[PDB]
């Protein structure tokens, strides 16, 4: 581990060809910039989830969304989402398991079978 310790970071403005044009900084990729395709699957995963949740129970869909968070980013735990609906107990976990096993059929989970990859 001593060797291979980034001995000398090469300058990002170094030339790449026979001339001083198109330096290395213009050829480095981006491992953090969200590509537009990956954002497309994000928006559609927001649309494809709102459609699958529209078939569930209204209160059940609300508690399932609160379990993860579609509009609200505050991902609540089982008990936290439990207090918002009824007595915080295994009933919330039971309804969550029932909903999860609900949209696993070829009818509801049809457009999502090719979504998880």
């Amino acid at each position: 581990k001593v060797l291979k310790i980034a001995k000398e970071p090469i300058s990002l403005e170094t030339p790449i060809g026979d001339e001083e044009d198109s330096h290395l900084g213009d050829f480095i990729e981006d491992k953090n910039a969200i590509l537009p395709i990956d954002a497309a699957i994000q928006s559609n995963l927001r649309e494809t989830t709102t459609r699958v949740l529209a078939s569930l129970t209204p209160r059940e869909e609300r508690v399932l969304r609160m379990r993860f968070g579609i509009g609200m980013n505050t991902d609540h735990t089982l008990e936290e989402v439990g207090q918002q609906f009824s007595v915080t107990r295994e009933r919330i976990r039971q309804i969550e398991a029932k909903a999860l096993r609900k949209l696993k059929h070829p009818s509801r989970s049809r457009k999502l079978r090719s979504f998880l990859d």
Binding site: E8, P9, D26, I28, K111
Partner: protein, 544 residues
């Protein structure tokens, strides 16, 4: 902005500004430690000077001693060095943005396509119209989700090709040639999903692009917005870029092949089969040509509507030719135009004036349709004509050896007694610079004469003379250089060579004359590569 992304190989790629900021931070920390340590007054002030130099180099780095990085030997760029060169807001950052949704492919002639339709490779249309293909698959219902669509087009399934031809129907794509010198360099075309992997470009439009098909990557762009997709149809279309912005001359004029075909169709000779054989309609000419009764030398009479006066004009039996009738039928019906324009030889200048008059008097739709027809007509009548270059095509003037001998003898009469500069100029200007157009003029005169066969009909016109007269690729200077005297080569300072250079490219040039030729031509070739830089600089100054 100055990243430190880990490159492939465990070697970090730190930006140039990172080293400058590190140096500035080091100088600041050293100055803070010296001030708190109560260093000598000559070291603290020297520390302040070092910090000042570091901050100077961090901003511009040019006004100082060009501080180089500790690792590399290249001059480190700074906040000012970035904005100056192309790698900042000048070219790389703001103006010359590496726009996505684009494509670069070698271009090929697209004569089977319309003037407003450019060939697009199927392997490139998918990568260019990926979001549009996804939208068409989602609206059509073929793909359930975006991920499934991307999984569909990624493998290039057979069901997505039908959607690609449907999405690319009226969506123009910007064809961007490598060098652009005017607004016609970016022309939008209704793409056609052609086979192969090369942009099938229209022959008439590549002249405006400055793009020949000897290798010219035409960068294709795709407008995403509904207005940009529509903006490329109202203004960036090839049909709307007929007349070049330089002057009132159409840039969609046939350059090389269509002009040659029209010249071959318009050349009229008094000797040919079917002399004065009056025809009924335009189709009668082709029906008789397919029967071998009338040739294409344009010497037969027929009927055609010229449409000169107000309103419709009667089908007057004109004394025109059959070859000029095939082009005359392509002309739109409108006053001030008709067969009167095709009566000339129909060279490149005349054909450009014809596309200009058809646009100057008639509309753009009829002008573009006439350009599309004449390109197909010129192409069909040029391949069937047989315009191949041959050994007897470039005819050397028979009255050339005698004139060369007399010139070289006149170059020796005054040279016996000898001022040397005056005698040299008499032997290079009046001896070789003069009579080199005399030999070229004699060659042109012997090439213009239509040789008549024993049967009273002329054999044929020289293909090189046809190319020179029609204006496709020939010229008087090029004719003289190819078959004439070849002129006199240049010098590094600009002086004309005094030695005799009597040989054309059709004949065998010895080593010395060809070396002089490549000594005079490399100057012009460098001017094509060096003076073009001055042209780009002038264009950049003018647009700004």
């Amino acid at each position: 902005l100055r990243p430190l992304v880990p490159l492939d190989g465990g070697r970090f790629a730190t930006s140039d500004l990172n080293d400058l900021y590190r140096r500035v931070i080091n100088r600041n920390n050293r100055l803070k430690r010296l001030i708190e340590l109560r260093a000598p007054d000559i070291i603290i002030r020297n520390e302040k000077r070092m910090l000042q130099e570091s901050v100077d180099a961090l901003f511009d780095n040019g006004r100082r001693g060009r501080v180089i990085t500790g690792a590399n030997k290249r001059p480190l760029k700074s906040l000012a060095d970035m904005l100056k060169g192309k790698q900042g807001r000048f070219r790389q950052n703001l103006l010359g943005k590496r726009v996505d949704y684009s494509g670069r492919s070698v271009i090929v002639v697209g004569p089977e396509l319309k003037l407003h339709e450019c060939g697009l490779p199927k392997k490139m249309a998918l990568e260019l119209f990926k979001p549009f293909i996804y939208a068409r698959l989602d609206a059509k219902g073929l793909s359930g989700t975006v991920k499934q669509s991307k999984r569909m087009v990624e493998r290039e399934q057979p069901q997505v090709w039908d959607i690609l031809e449907e999405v690319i129907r009226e969506h123009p794509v910007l064809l961007n040639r490598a060098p652009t010198l005017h607004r016609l360099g970016i022309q939008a075309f209704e793409p056609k999903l052609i086979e192969g992997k090369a942009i099938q470009l229209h022959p008439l439009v590549c002249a405006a692009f400055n793009a020949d098909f000897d290798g010219d990557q035409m960068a294709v762009h795709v407008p995403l917005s509904l207005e940009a997709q529509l903006e490329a149809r109202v203004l960036m279309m090839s049909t709307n870029n007929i007349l070049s912005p330089a002057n009132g001359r159409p840039i969609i004029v046939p350059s090389q092949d269509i002009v040659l075909g029209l010249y071959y169709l318009s050349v009229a000779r008094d000797g040919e089969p079917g002399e004065g054989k009056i025809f009924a309609d335009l189709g009668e000419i082709e029906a008789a040509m397919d029967a071998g009764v009338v040739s294409l030398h344009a010497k037969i009479k027929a009927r055609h509507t010229e449409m000169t006066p107000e309103g419709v004009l009667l089908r007057k039996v004109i004394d025109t030719t059959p070859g000029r009738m095939k082009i005359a039928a392509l002309l739109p019906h409108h006053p001030q135009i008709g067969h009167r324009l095709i009566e000339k030889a129909l060279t490149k200048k005349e054909i450009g004036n014809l596309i200009d008059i058809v646009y100057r008097h008639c509309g753009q739709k009829a002008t573009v349709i006439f350009a599309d027809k004449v390109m197909g007509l010129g192409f069909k009548e040029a391949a069937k004509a047989g315009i191949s270059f041959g050994k007897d095509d470039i005819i050397i003037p028979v009255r050339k050896t005698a004139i060369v001998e007399e010139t070289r003898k006149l170059a020796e009469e005054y040279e016996q007694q000898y001022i040397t500069k005056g005698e040299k100029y008499n032997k290079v200007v009046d001896a070789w610079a003069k009579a080199t157009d005399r030999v070229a003029d004699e060659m042109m005169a012997e090439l213009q004469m239509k040789h008549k066969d024993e049967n009273g009909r002329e054999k044929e016109i020289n293909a090189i003379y046809m190319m020179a007269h029609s204006g496709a690729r020939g010229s008087q200077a090029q004719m003289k250089q190819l078959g004439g005297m070849r002129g006199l080569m240049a010098k590094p300072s600009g002086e004309i060579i005094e030695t005799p250079i009597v040989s054309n490219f059709k004949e065998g040039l010895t080593v010395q004359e060809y070396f002089n030729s490549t000594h005079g031509a490399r100057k012009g070739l460098a001017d094509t590569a060096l003076k073009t830089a001055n042209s780009g600089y002038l264009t950049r100054r003018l647009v700004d």
